[PDB]
Amino acid sequence: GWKWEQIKEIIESGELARLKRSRQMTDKYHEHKKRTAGLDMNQYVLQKLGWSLDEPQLENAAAKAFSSSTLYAVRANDFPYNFEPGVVHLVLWSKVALPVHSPDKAVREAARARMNAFLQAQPLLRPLLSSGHVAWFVNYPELQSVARIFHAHVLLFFPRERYSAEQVKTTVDDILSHGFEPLA
Ligand SMILES: [Zn+2]
């Protein structure tokens, strides 16, 4: 799998298609694809996250992305990409889209700045941020699924010489249980 420095270089160059699953994980992803071939996965995800129109509305319509914990959700990626041991592949879903690949440089930079501020503000990521061991990307339209719901790939690096696999499990379970904290 990709080493952390390679991951950072790929994200920086925008060559996101290079971030691929292993042959085997590609096989499993293929079988899950067979299973969901009869579904609109946008509606499925909305349903699972509690964001369907059926649900109540703790909204103000104009709420800023990440301004309230009801507006986002972090999950472990069930079919992670092929990264070196210690890299944890999470998915951050947001009810509010962030136009991070807009042709408008002002809009794109502003949307990226918001995502960055959100992740930087997270106490549960503090030592990883201090280490440069948090990265994120949003797959382009020609690469993504579930295009009606914003989601970012959030990668956390726990080097093997710094965290046992069991300590990684513990910390990630902690993050997913607590969730991320909102940002005004
Ligand atoms: Zn949640």
Author numbering: 16 to 199
Quote the study's own text.
Crystals of this protein diffracted to 1.9 Å resolution. We asked all human competitors to build the best possible protein structure that they could given the protein sequence, a secondary structure prediction and an experimentally phased, density refined map of YPL067C. The superiority of the top Foldit structure can be attributed to better side-chain conformations than those in the top structure produced by the trained crystallographers. YPL067C's structure yielded unexpected insights into its biological function. We find here that HTC1 is very effective in preventing in vitro amyloid formation of three model proteins, Aβ1–40, α-synuclein and reduced carboxy-methylated α-lactalbumin (RCMalA).
We chose YPL067C, a yeast protein with no significant sequence similarity to any structure in the Protein Data Bank (PDB) as the target for our competition. In addition, YPL067C was chosen for its biological interest, as previous studies suggested that YPL067C is involved in preventing amyloid toxicity. Despite the lack of sequence homology to any protein in the PDB, a DALI16 search of YPL067C found that it is structurally similar to members of the widely conserved superfamily of histidine triad (HIT) proteins. YPL067C's characterization makes it the founding member of a new family we are calling HTC (for histidine triad with channel), with YPL067C being the first member, HTC1.
